[PDB]
Amino acid sequence: MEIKKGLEDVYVKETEITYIDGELGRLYYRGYSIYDLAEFSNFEEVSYLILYGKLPNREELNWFQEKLREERYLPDFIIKFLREVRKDAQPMDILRTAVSLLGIEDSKNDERTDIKGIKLISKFPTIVANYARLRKGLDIIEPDPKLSHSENFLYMLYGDRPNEIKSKAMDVTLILHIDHEMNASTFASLVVASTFSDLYSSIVAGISALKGPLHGGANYEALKMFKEIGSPEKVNDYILNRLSNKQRIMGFGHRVYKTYDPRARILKQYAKLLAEKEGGEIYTLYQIAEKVEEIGIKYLGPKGIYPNVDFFSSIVFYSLGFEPDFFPAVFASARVVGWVAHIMEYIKDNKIIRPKAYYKGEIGKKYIPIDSR
Amino acid sequence: MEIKKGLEDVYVKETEITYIDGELGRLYYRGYSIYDLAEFSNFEEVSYLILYGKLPNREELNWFQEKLREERYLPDFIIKFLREVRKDAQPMDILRTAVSLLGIEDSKNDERTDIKGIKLISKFPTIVANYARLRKGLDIIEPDPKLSHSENFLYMLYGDRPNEIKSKAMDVTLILHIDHEMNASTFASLVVASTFSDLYSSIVAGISALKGPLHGGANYEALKMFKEIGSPEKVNDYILNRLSNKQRIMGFGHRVYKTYDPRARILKQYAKLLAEKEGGEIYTLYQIAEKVEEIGIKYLGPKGIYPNVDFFSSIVFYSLGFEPDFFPAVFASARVVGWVAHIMEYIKDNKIIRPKAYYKGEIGKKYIPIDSR
């Protein structure tokens, strides 16, 4: 008799994958600290950790990143799709459709869902980079099997190998987005998966939810804010003006964290490094951002709202050569690893997710003929 | 502290759209009896009822079925998709992808979500029929704006206008599938919709869940059963053999109905009429089915399991010229009206659906170097 609309404060699964202490500002993947993973690991190793629940030994990881380079190539049909398609399409809708097409082109039904997962995960960056070039009137530049995941992403975007700070930054950035708290998109995945529909279907649902505007994170309005604050001399009137007629500060606040976002803390170092190595309009943006961070923490911090990952992730994505409407799709590249993991975890004891609805209408109405209406 | 995995017995919304009394075998759309709707209404009128919550007057319905014929045409890109695509693709995956593409080709963002809904709903049959022809090596035969929804569906399948019993049957069949009890696919829709992602996204999630094998209804294993029971002399050993080593009887039982499915009762008349008007292998199938219904009700009825809509819907779909792997997609044609309705209803007071997950793992693990592993 109590309608739990929103499912806020209902538990839909147990999990071993990701733990967040929003009180202490702590984040663990399989019980490993995101700080340590950011510092000592990489995308490939962290993905294995998260899919399989433990750090790989040298042979396991070697097998794992072998599958990951092996299947980066898109089939011709979907590549045909990419260059033939409307070029003012939303990159998310491109990603959604391409994954859907990938499902059609896949005919191996004997395949373990994790193997199917690897290959999907490995193609996201190829879809994303390929569309970005095509959109800019350049040409598909193919994945280089020799390269590691994050380097190859930037490779297929630039056409040339990225310098090592850029690919580090890319790698840590993707690591920071692989998984987080149960949400609409991870859950949309699980709903589809719990009917044992195919992996591609589930991931299409994940993307379909993630691109929703109401979805937490994937905001990137923060870059826009830094932009319209012109100088960093201008920042305090801007922000104080915003607060006085209570308007949000982009890249601040969080549904779970009541402290500085550990992902933001980690990502800040790369935002700063990239910016100061670029030196341009983009270094001045970073200067804006510190000024905003400073006064933002001052006024908002005592209410337990601080900068979050989006606050720096949008400077970084920018420095790394992506255009703002690709940001969510690069997010998706990371998060799809999380989606696959949860699906794997959820379907060991599958339960099809079918909630109830409470009918509060009338019944037994007489069917009235249309002229009498 | 209680994990509600499956969300069985959790209410995720109030609703005014559809009411099922599984105890009394009753089914209402907007408080109108499905018996009366089947008998006195049509697909177009029932769709309006369900989208808007009341029977239309002559001007409202006239407007409504105007929109419905106006937008049946698919854009060239997706038609290009259809004839270019793998022809051993699952019709559901075709439908999923096409709807996704439809989203890309749509650039009207100022559009009411119900108007967007009409046009989507009207194109499903065009996608389905077009693929069925192309798959069979025939050619796209375009929608005839002059015709009504259900007649035009069969038209685009056959290439010629269907006789009136066939289009009646089609019409009532689609009516019977527009909406039903909250489930994985309607809910997958709602999860995406509750982030205010676009309609196409939500519907892609709906299809993605509906094609899941674990999903209630959309079974159509019943046709297969009638087929392998050769004569209807053969039926009693077959079924009794099945029951003795407890195997399910296809087209029987239901999660909510503990009586004869009202939709099955209504659909039976058309299964019977179509069959006996065909007279062939397909009339003998129907004879099989009655025999199975008879002994099935005898042995299973006292446990409150009876035939359900799938029991006859698969004979009908068959008689109407569809191949068995198109059955779910014709289902989808109907149900998408329900999906649109629920989304419309859910987002008047939107709440983004983000459940919680309970972490039952460890934290604070020490990151061990890969050689030490």
Decide: B334 and B174 in contact? Cβ < 8 Å: yes
Q: Which residues fall within 8 angstroms of residue A168, CB to CB, at 6 or more apart?
A: A150, A270
Count of CB atoms situated within 10 Å of the CB of A365: 16
Q: Find the CB nearest A357 among B3, B12, B96.
A: B12
Q: How does strand A356-359 pair with strand B18-21? A: unpaired
Decide: B124 and B328 in contact? Cβ < 8 Å: no
Closest CA to A294 of A308, A307, A303: A307
Q: Find the CB nearest B201 among A26, A183, A211.
A: A211
Closest CA to A207 of A120, A105, A86: A120
What is the arrangement of strands in the sheet containing B18-21, beginning at the earlier edge strand?
B18-21, B26-29, B32-33
Closest CA to A12 of B214, B180, B202, B187: B187
What Cα–Cα distance (Å) separates residue A370 from each residue in A142, A355, B58, B59, B359? 62, 36, 6, 10, 57
Decide: B29 and A373 in contact? Cβ < 8 Å: no
Residue A165, both tokens: 């700070």
Count of CB atoms situated within 10 Å of the CB of B3: 15
Decide: B11 and B187 in contact? Cβ < 8 Å: no
DSSP type of residue B101: H
- Backbone phi, then psi, for B12, in 5-degree steps? -110, -5
Q: Which residues fall within 8 angstroms of residue A157, CB to CB, at 6 or more apart?
A: A129, A132, A133, A320, A321, A322
Beta bridge partners of A20: A27
What Cα–Cα distance (Å) separates residue B359 from each residue in A11, A149, A153, A180, B356? 10, 29, 32, 12, 10
What Cα–Cα distance (Å) separates residue B309 from each residue in B94, B250, B252, B266, B271? 25, 11, 9, 9, 11
Q: Which residue of B has its CA nearest to A350?
A: B6
Count of CB atoms situated within 10 Å of the CB of A67: 15
- Backbone phi, then psi, for A258, in 5-degree steps? -115, 15
Long-range contact pairs involving A41-46 (C-beta distance under 8 Å, separation at least 24): A41/A175, A41/B367, A42/A148, A42/A149, A42/A150, A42/A171, A42/A175, A43/A148, A43/A149, A43/A150, A43/A171, A43/A174, A43/A175, A43/A178, A43/A334, A44/A68, A44/A148, A44/A149, A45/B370, A46/A175, A46/A178
End-to-end Cα, chain B, rounded Å: 35
Q: How far apart are CA B102 and CA B118, in angstroms?
A: 13
**Residue B108 at interface with chain A, using a CB cutoff of 8 Å:** no
Q: How far apart are CA B35 and CA A28, in angstroms?
A: 56
**Residue A161 at interface with chain B, using a CB cutoff of 8 Å:** no
DSSP type of residue A245: T
Buried b (16+ CB within 10 A) or exposed e, B31-47: bbbbbebbeebbbbbbb
Amino acid identity for residue B168 in this structure: K
Q: Which residues fall within 8 angstroms of residue A85, CB to CB, at 6 or more apart?
A: A94, B77, B104
Q: How far apart are CA A96 and CA A101, in angstroms?
A: 9
Q: How far apart are CA B196 and CA A208, in angstroms?
A: 10
Q: How far apart are CA A22 and CA A255, in angstroms?
A: 9
B104 vs A94: CB contact, 8 Å cut-off?
yes
Beta bridge partners of B358: A14
Q: How far apart are CA A285 and CA B129, in angstroms?
A: 54
Amino acid identity for residue A187 in this structure: F
Buried b (16+ CB within 10 A) or exposed e, B77-105: ebbebbeebeeebbbbbbbbbbbbbbbbb
Q: How far apart are CA B74 and CA A38, in angstroms?
A: 48
- Which residue among A171, A179, A261, A310 is the active-site one? A310
Q: Which residues fall within 8 angstroms of residue B301, CB to CB, at 6 or more apart?
A: none
Decide: B19 and B31 in contact? Cβ < 8 Å: yes
Residue of B49, B181, B191 to mutate, testing the A interface (most A Cβ within 10 Å of its Cβ): B191
What Cα–Cα distance (Å) separates residue A297 from each residue in A27, A271, A291, A313, A339? 21, 18, 10, 18, 33
Chain-centroid distance of CA B48 in Å reads 17
Count of CB atoms situated within 10 Å of the CB of B138: 12
How far A199 CA sits from the closest chain B CA (Å)? 10
Count of CB atoms situated within 10 Å of the CB of B59: 8
HEC profile of B292-348:
HHHHHHHHHHHHCCCECHHHHHHHHHHHCCCCHHHHHHHHHHHHHHHHHHHHHHHHH
Q: How far apart are CA A149 and CA A155, in angstroms?
A: 10
Q: Which residues fall within 8 angstroms of residue A58, CB to CB, at 6 or more apart?
A: B370, B371, B373
Q: How far apart are CA B49 and CA B268, in angstroms?
A: 24
Closest CA to B341 of B205, B220, B213, B199: B199
Active site residue B215: no
Place of tokens 């649902």: A205
- Which residue among B149, B177, B180, B254 is the active-site one? B254
Decide: B75 and B105 in contact? Cβ < 8 Å: yes
B354 vs A216: CB contact, 8 Å cut-off?
yes
Q: How far apart are CA A191 and CA B106, in angstroms?
A: 27
**What is the sign, positive or negative, of the torsion defined by CA atoms of B181, B340, B148, B163?**
negative
Q: How does strand B11-15 pair with strand A356-359? A: parallel
A192 vs B202: CB contact, 8 Å cut-off?
no
Residue of B8, B12, B48, B79 to mutate, testing the A interface (most A Cβ within 10 Å of its Cβ): B12
B97 CB neighbours in chain A (<8 A) are 97, 100-101, 103-104
Q: Find the CB nearest A10 among B56, B61, B355.
A: B355
Q: How far apart are CA B177 and CA B341, in angstroms?
A: 13
- Which residue among A177, A180, A254, A342 is the active-site one? A254
**What is the sign, positive or negative, of the torsion defined by CA atoms of A287, A288, A293, A295?**
positive
Q: How far apart are CA B357 and CA B4, in angstroms?
A: 10
Residue B305, both tokens: 């399991």
Q: How far apart are CA A207 and CA A121, in angstroms?
A: 13
Chain-centroid distance of CA A78 in Å reads 22
Q: Where are the alpha helices (DSSP H) in A71-183?
A: 76-84, 91-105, 113-135, 149-158, 164-175
Residue of B192, B325, B349 to mutate, testing the A interface (most A Cβ within 10 Å of its Cβ): B192
Closest CA to B69 of B125, B146, B142: B146
Residues 185-244 of A with CB under 8 A from B: 185, 187-188, 191-192, 194-197, 201-202, 204-205, 208-216
Helices B113-135, B91-105: inter-axial angle, 10-degree rounding: 130
DSSP string, A271-315: HHHHHHHH-SHHHHHHHHHHHHHHHHHHHHGGGT--B-HHHHHHH
- Backbone phi, then psi, for B290, in 5-degree steps? -65, -45
**What is the sign, positive or negative, of the torsion defined by CA atoms of B289, B291, B293, B296?**
negative
Would residue A23 be called left, alpha or beta, if left means φ above 0 and alpha means ψ between -120 and 50 degrees?
A: alpha
Q: How far apart are CA A199 and CA A230, in angstroms?
A: 46
Count of CB atoms situated within 10 Å of the CB of A134: 18
Q: How far apart are CA A296 and CA A224, in angstroms?
A: 16
Closest CA to A125 of A105, A103, A155: A155
Q: Where are the alpha helices (DSSP H) in B86-194?
A: 91-105, 113-135, 149-158, 164-175, 184-193
Q: Side-chain half-sphere of B316: how many Cα atoms within 13 Å?
A: 29
Method of structure determination: X-ray
Q: How far apart are CA B127 and CA B118, in angstroms?
A: 15
Count of CB atoms situated within 10 Å of the CB of A224: 13
Q: How far apart are CA A155 and CA A37, in angstroms?
A: 23
Active site residue B254: yes
Amino acid identity for residue B280 in this structure: G
Q: How does strand A32-33 pair with strand A26-29? A: antiparallel
Amino acid identity for residue B31 in this structure: G
Beta bridge partners of B21: B26
Count of CB atoms situated within 10 Å of the CB of B291: 20
Decide: B5 and A12 in contact? Cβ < 8 Å: yes
DSSP type of residue B246: T
What is the experimental resolution, given in Å to one decimal place? 2.7
Residue A203, both tokens: 């991931």
Place of tokens 């676009």: B198
Q: How far apart are CA A19 and CA B324, in angstroms?
A: 45
Decide: B348 and B218 in contact? Cβ < 8 Å: no
* Domains assigned to chain A: 13-216+321-353 (1.10.580.10), 217-320 (1.10.230.10)
Residues 112-151 of A with CB under 8 A from B: none
Kindly report the length of chain A: 373
Decide: A191 and A342 in contact? Cβ < 8 Å: no
Decide: A48 and B40 in contact? Cβ < 8 Å: no
Buried b (16+ CB within 10 A) or exposed e, A249-262: bbbbbbeebbbbbb
Helices A281-300, A221-228: inter-axial angle, 10-degree rounding: 100
Amino acid identity for residue B353 in this structure: I
How buried is residue A23: exposed, middle or buried, by Cβ count under 10 Å (0-12/13-18/19+)?
Answer: exposed
- Backbone phi, then psi, for A71, in 5-degree steps? -120, 30
Q: Find the CB nearest A12 among B5, B211, B214.
A: B5
Decide: B206 and B333 in contact? Cβ < 8 Å: no
**Residue A103 at interface with chain B, using a CB cutoff of 8 Å:** yes
